[PDB]
Amino acid sequence: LKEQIGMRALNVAETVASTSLVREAFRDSNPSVRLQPFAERIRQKTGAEYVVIGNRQGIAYAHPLTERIGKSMIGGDNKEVLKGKSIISEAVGSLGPAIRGKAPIFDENGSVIGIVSVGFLLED
Amino acid sequence: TLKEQIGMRALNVAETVASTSLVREAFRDSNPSVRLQPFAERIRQKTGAEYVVIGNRQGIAYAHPLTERIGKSMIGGDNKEVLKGKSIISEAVGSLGPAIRGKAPIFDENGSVIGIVSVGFLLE
């Protein structure tokens, strides 16, 4: 069950990472203008705790707490995602145990330009 | 239950696809399949789904894992609740075995339903 909630998280992250809107926003001077409303819409519709979209350093362009945008970093190891891999991992935050999926964002030439990290609270 | 989580996986992918600007915009095109089919296929591949079918209000498939089925195949199962704006999880069977699927409505800018996304995962 924990594995399938992780697959929920990863499938949402992969779908967000493959959306043209997300890839295109990284060409904007402020990617958050387009990234944050989309991430929030997806977070609401799917029941996720967060849909965080960040650059290669993990700096969040989108975050469920808008005051954290540009300040918070995608938590956990991101080295594998920067290699183009998709990663499921367990984590914890103030709201409790979570499982998250991270997917790379690719440009038109296959380079990783960012990370999508989607987390679900471990709860029925 | 693991089956219920696989159904949430299917529905979360369908909801995320249905919320993308590409999918909402493509329904205005002369041939929506030109933009819908490559996106649906990419999401199908990345998520491990058996199918990401995108259809119109009458259920005609504009994207399908078999390109020869575009236009000929209809989204299977009751769609009446989706046209009412509801998201629905259901079980079905096909040539490849039992599957669980989730259906989400596609909305235009005025909140009218313009189509359906149906995502299916094989129970395996």
Contact state of B19 with A42 under an 8 Å Cβ cutoff: yes
The type of residue at A92 is V
* Two tokens, residue A32: 């958050």
Name the residue among A2, A59, A3 with its Cα closest to residue A26.
A59
CA distance B63 to chain A (A): 16
A29 contacts: CB under 8 Å, gap ≥ 6: none
Helix axes A2-17, A32-46, angle to 10 degrees: 150
User: Distances in Å between the alpha carbon of A6 and those of A31, A69, A90, B89?
Assistant: 27, 25, 8, 19
Experimental technique, in short, is X-ray
Q: Which residue has the tokens 């996986």?
A: B9
Choose the mutation target among A1, A2, A3, A4 for the interface with B, i.e. most B CBs under 10 Å.
A4
Choose the mutation target among B12, B34, B45, B107 for the interface with A, i.e. most A CBs under 10 Å.
B12
Fold entry, domain B2-122: Beta-Lactamase (3.30.450)
For residue B43, the chain A residues in CB contact (below 8 A) are 14-15, 18
Domain A2-121: CATH class, spelled out: alpha beta
For residue B46, the chain A residues in CB contact (below 8 A) are 11, 14-15, 18, 103
Helix axes B33-47, A2-17, angle to 10 degrees: 150
User: Distances in Å between the alpha carbon of A118 and those of A15, B6, B19, B45, B67?
Assistant: 11, 17, 16, 19, 31
What is the C-alpha separation between B104 and B96, in angstroms, rounded? 23
User: Distances in Å between the alpha carbon of B2 and those of B6, B30, B46, B124?
Assistant: 6, 41, 21, 11
Q: Which residue has the tokens 């799917």?
A: A46
For residue B12, the chain A residues in CB contact (below 8 A) are 8, 11-12, 45-47
Contact, B115 vs B57, CB < 8 A? yes
End-to-end CA distance of chain A: 10
A49 contacts: CB under 8 Å, gap ≥ 6: A43, A64, A93, A95, A98, A119, A120, A121
Resolution (Å units) = 1.6
Q: Which residue has the tokens 């029941």?
A: A47
